[PDB]
Design an enzyme around this catalytic site. Structure first.
Site, PDB file in Angstrom:
ATOM      1  N   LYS A 124     -10.259  -0.337  -5.311  1.00  0.00           N
ATOM      2  CA  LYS A 124     -10.880  -1.332  -4.438  1.00  0.00           C
ATOM      3  C   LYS A 124     -10.231  -2.697  -4.657  1.00  0.00           C
ATOM      4  O   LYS A 124     -10.276  -3.247  -5.760  1.00  0.00           O
ATOM      5  CB  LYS A 124     -12.394  -1.398  -4.673  1.00  0.00           C
ATOM      6  CG  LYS A 124     -13.147  -0.154  -4.218  1.00  0.00           C
ATOM      7  CD  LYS A 124     -14.630  -0.229  -4.547  1.00  0.00           C
ATOM      8  CE  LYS A 124     -15.329   1.075  -4.186  1.00  0.00           C
ATOM      9  NZ  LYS A 124     -16.793   1.025  -4.445  1.00  0.00           N
TER      10      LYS A 124
ATOM     11  N   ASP B 228       6.875   7.763  -0.700  1.00  0.00           N
ATOM     12  CA  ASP B 228       5.619   7.611   0.035  1.00  0.00           C
ATOM     13  C   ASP B 228       5.699   6.504   1.095  1.00  0.00           C
ATOM     14  O   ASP B 228       4.742   5.751   1.303  1.00  0.00           O
ATOM     15  CB  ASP B 228       4.457   7.356  -0.937  1.00  0.00           C
ATOM     16  CG  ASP B 228       3.089   7.608  -0.307  1.00  0.00           C
ATOM     17  OD1 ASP B 228       3.015   8.237   0.774  1.00  0.00           O
ATOM     18  OD2 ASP B 228       2.079   7.174  -0.901  1.00  0.00           O
TER      19      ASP B 228
ATOM     20  N   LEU C 240       3.423   3.794   7.367  1.00  0.00           N
ATOM     21  CA  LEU C 240       2.938   2.559   7.979  1.00  0.00           C
ATOM     22  C   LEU C 240       1.870   1.864   7.131  1.00  0.00           C
ATOM     23  O   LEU C 240       1.818   0.634   7.073  1.00  0.00           O
ATOM     24  CB  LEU C 240       2.411   2.829   9.391  1.00  0.00           C
ATOM     25  CG  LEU C 240       3.384   3.394  10.432  1.00  0.00           C
ATOM     26  CD1 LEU C 240       2.629   3.763  11.695  1.00  0.00           C
ATOM     27  CD2 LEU C 240       4.511   2.416  10.748  1.00  0.00           C
TER      28      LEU C 240
ATOM     29  N   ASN D 146       1.705   1.781   3.951  1.00  0.00           N
ATOM     30  CA  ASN D 146       2.297   1.239   2.727  1.00  0.00           C
ATOM     31  C   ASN D 146       3.251   0.066   2.976  1.00  0.00           C
ATOM     32  O   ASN D 146       3.764  -0.540   2.030  1.00  0.00           O
ATOM     33  CB  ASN D 146       2.980   2.345   1.915  1.00  0.00           C
ATOM     34  CG  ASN D 146       1.990   3.206   1.140  1.00  0.00           C
ATOM     35  OD1 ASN D 146       2.308   4.323   0.741  1.00  0.00           O
ATOM     36  ND2 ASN D 146       0.787   2.685   0.923  1.00  0.00           N
TER      37      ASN D 146
HETATM   38  N1  LIG Z   1      -0.952  -6.387  -1.957  1.00  0.00           N
HETATM   39  C1  LIG Z   1      -2.068  -6.341  -1.190  1.00  0.00           C
HETATM   40  N2  LIG Z   1      -2.528  -7.449  -0.560  1.00  0.00           N
HETATM   41  C2  LIG Z   1      -3.638  -7.423   0.206  1.00  0.00           C
HETATM   42  N3  LIG Z   1      -4.372  -6.313   0.411  1.00  0.00           N
HETATM   43  C3  LIG Z   1      -4.026  -5.129  -0.159  1.00  0.00           C
HETATM   44  C4  LIG Z   1      -2.826  -5.077  -1.012  1.00  0.00           C
HETATM   45  N4  LIG Z   1      -2.714  -3.808  -1.442  1.00  0.00           N
HETATM   46  C5  LIG Z   1      -3.750  -3.108  -0.913  1.00  0.00           C
HETATM   47  N5  LIG Z   1      -4.534  -3.892  -0.148  1.00  0.00           N
HETATM   48  C6  LIG Z   1      -5.754  -3.467   0.590  1.00  0.00           C
HETATM   49  O1  LIG Z   1      -6.241  -2.213   0.098  1.00  0.00           O
HETATM   50  C7  LIG Z   1      -6.358  -1.249   1.150  1.00  0.00           C
HETATM   51  C8  LIG Z   1      -5.719   0.069   0.731  1.00  0.00           C
HETATM   52  O2  LIG Z   1      -4.465  -0.181   0.098  1.00  0.00           O
HETATM   53  P1  LIG Z   1      -3.712   0.971  -0.739  1.00  0.00           P
HETATM   54  O3  LIG Z   1      -2.499   0.348  -1.390  1.00  0.00           O
HETATM   55  O4  LIG Z   1      -3.551   2.176   0.157  1.00  0.00           O
HETATM   56  O5  LIG Z   1      -4.777   1.341  -1.893  1.00  0.00           O
HETATM   57  P2  LIG Z   1      -4.313   1.972  -3.304  1.00  0.00           P
HETATM   58  O6  LIG Z   1      -4.047   0.756  -4.162  1.00  0.00           O
HETATM   59  O7  LIG Z   1      -5.501   2.799  -3.738  1.00  0.00           O
HETATM   60  O8  LIG Z   1      -3.083   2.792  -2.986  1.00  0.00           O
HETATM   61  C9  LIG Z   1      -5.680  -1.825   2.385  1.00  0.00           C
HETATM   62  O9  LIG Z   1      -6.518  -1.673   3.535  1.00  0.00           O
HETATM   63  C10 LIG Z   1      -5.423  -3.287   2.067  1.00  0.00           C
HETATM   64  O10 LIG Z   1      -6.253  -4.145   2.855  1.00  0.00           O
END
Ligand SMILES: Nc1ncnc2c1ncn2[C@@H]1O[C@H](COP(=O)(O)OP(=O)(O)O)[C@@H](O)[C@H]1O
Length: 285
Positions: free
Chosen positions: A29, A137, A140, A142
């Site tokens: 989160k 991985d 879109l 990422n």
């Molecule tokens: N560097 C970042 N800056 C802002 N929001 C981020 C960033 N990384 C992830 N998020 C938020 O977290 C959500 C999921 O990101 P994700 O990278 O897929 O999660 P995880 O860290 O579990 O892989 C996205 O909808 C995005 O809003």
């Protein structure tokens, strides 16, 4: 459980004020965090220890890979720490969500936009490959966006660093729509799996849907291993020519990252240097 309002680490001994919610995903989160003394804003990934030495090894390698990275097209890694309940990854703030949310709101985008998004993304991928990092991985969701609409490649949870010259990886990992055929067959793979995923990205941007998109997961995998897709006749022959090359069945016949930047697709038509934030919802005028 409740995530502390002030995030403190034994190492740097800095304090991060936990602010607004940004989103969640794979057992994490994310929050907008501010250093309470210098007022610098970051994105704080907060992961529960209940979600975690098998899974803890996969995260510790992600951190080690991400930490060693520094590039204007990669999500900046600014530090990591853990207390007794949560692990805190401090990242560069990307307030314009991801290219997935742009895709869902826009569907097929204009040709100049794909040039801009792909170029910045490939420049990031080139940096990664020059340092022997395979992302594995690329999708879109990422490719993150900041307030200036700059692409920021993120999530290195499936990434791998290679040491010796001709190392071929064997782990079956990725996202169904973007996984390379050589990864599914488990025979062995290298750097050109990122090129394949990039070809899926380009297709999705210009067409409005993933090339192997199906209602069935089992079917999607069969399509990929059989190389079964078709680029619509409405797409510019130049872009479709490039897509066909990036999505080649033979990994050795796919363009290199260096070969991608100097393609006719990036040198012929209009290539904007900047995109307004309006591209998130409507086509640029
Ligand atoms: N560097 C970042 N800056 C802002 N929001 C981020 C960033 N990384 C992830 N998020 C938020 O977290 C959500 C999921 O990101 P994700 O990278 O897929 O999660 P995880 O860290 O579990 O892989 C996205 O909808 C995005 O809003």
């Amino acid at each position: 459980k409740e995530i502390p309002d002030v995030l403190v680490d034994p190492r740097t001994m800095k304090r991060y004020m936990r602010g607004r919610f940004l989103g969640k995903g794979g057992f994490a989160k994310c929050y907008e965090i501010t250093d309470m003394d210098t007022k610098e804003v970051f994105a704080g990934k907060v992961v529960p220890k209940s979600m975690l030495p098998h899974q803890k090894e996969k995260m510790s390698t992600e951190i080690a890979i991400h930490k060693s990275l520094d590039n204007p097209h990669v999500v900046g890694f600014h530090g990591f720490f853990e207390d007794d309940d949560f692990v805190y990854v401090v990242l560069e703030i990307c307030r314009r969500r991801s290219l997935l949310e742009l895709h869902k709101r826009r569907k097929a985008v204009t040709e100049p936009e794909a040039r801009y998004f792909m170029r910045q993304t490939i420049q990031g991928v080139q940096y990664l490959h020059n340092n022997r990092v395979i992302h594995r991985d690329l999708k879109l969701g990422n490719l993150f966006l900041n307030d200036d609409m700059d692409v920021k490649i993120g999530d290195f949870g499936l990434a791998t660093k290679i040491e010796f010259d001709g190392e071929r990886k064997k782990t079956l990992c990725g996202t169904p729509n973007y996984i390379a055929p050589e990864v599914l067959c488990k025979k062995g793979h290298s750097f050109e799996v990122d090129i394949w995923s990039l070809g899926c990205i380009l297709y999705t941007l210009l067409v409005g849907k993933p090339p192997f998109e199906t209602s069935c997961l089992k079917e999607t995998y069969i399509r990929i291993k059989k190389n079964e897709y078709s680029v619509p006749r409405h797409i510019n022959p130049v872009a479709s020519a490039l897509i066909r090359r990036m999505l080649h069945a033979d990994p050795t016949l796919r363009p290199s990252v260096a070969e991608l930047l100097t393609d006719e697709f990036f040198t012929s038509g209009y290539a904007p240097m900047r995109l307004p934030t309006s591209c998130l919802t409507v086509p640029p005028r």
